[PDB]
């Protein structure tokens, strides 16, 4: 199985992963609140907004992340943020998540003033992520791997970032082998989708120009991270 240094590291990442979850006050508006395009756009930008904060906290706690250059630090978080929201989306809409709570989120997302033209493929992709039957351990690592990407624009010390992603990859790869000896190209088919994640990055930029309701406004931190 995994080694003692790849198990401390595992254990740790999972903790920080599960550390924060959605605050009730948001989870209340998902169940018990107005079902207009407006308002849904409100719940979904509250949600998005919680999610970066929770991200920025998980990232901070990545082993050796705060060693890195503070300029690099921003560039990874700006770089990975949309990608982590997509990936957590994926996991969300497959999850053993119980009765109708995600059915509910799927239904709000579709009455929040986004076109079915953008909305249809992002679930269609979430479907295929799902087919690959990943564990929360797997989601947690890939999420780390995508944040600690050293190939991102404006990284000034690419070597420092890869000395951190490497373990995370080792660990994920091994656990792909442990989990799934059936077919042995499963690790590579994981990574391959991480590349696909990067494609949607610019699609996300685009659709944001069309995603306005009531003449409302995204929240400030959303304007920084998705640059709107």
């Amino acid at each position: 199985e995994l080694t003692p240094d790849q198990q401390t590291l595992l254990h740790f990442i999972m903790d920080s992963y599960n550390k924060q979850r959605m605050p009730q006050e948001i989870t209340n508006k998902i169940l018990k609140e107005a079902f207009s395009a407006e308002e849904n756009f409100l719940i979904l930008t509250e949600m998005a907004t919680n999610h970066v904060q929770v991200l920025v906290e998980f990232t901070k706690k990545l082993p050796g992340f705060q060693t890195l250059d503070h300029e690099d630090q921003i560039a990874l978080l700006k770089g990975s943020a949309v990608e982590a929201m997509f990936l957590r989306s994926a996991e969300i809409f497959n999850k053993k998540l119980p009765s109708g709570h995600s059915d509910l989120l799927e239904a709000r997302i579709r009455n929040s003033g986004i076109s079915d033209e953008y909305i249809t493929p992002m679930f269609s992709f979430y479907k295929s992520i799902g087919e690959l039957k990943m564990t929360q351990e797997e989601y947690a690592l890939l999420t780390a791997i995508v944040i600690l990407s050293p190939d991102r624009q404006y990284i000034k010390d690419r070597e420092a970032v890869e000395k951190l992603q490497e373990p995370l990859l080792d660990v994920l790869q091994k656990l792909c082998k442990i989990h799934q000896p059936e077919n042995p190209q499963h690790f590579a088919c994981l990574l391959g989708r991480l590349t696909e994640l990067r494609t949607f990055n610019h699609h996300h930029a685009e659709m944001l120009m069309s995603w306005r309701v009531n003449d409302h406004k995204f929240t400030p931190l959303l304007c920084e991270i998705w640059d709107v």
Binding site: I74, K78, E224
Partner: peptide, 12 residues
């Protein structure tokens, strides 16, 4: 630029 994001990364 990214003063909010830098604050979240730097705040204790």
């Amino acid at each position: 630029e990214n003063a909010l994001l830098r604050y979240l990364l730097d705040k204790d």
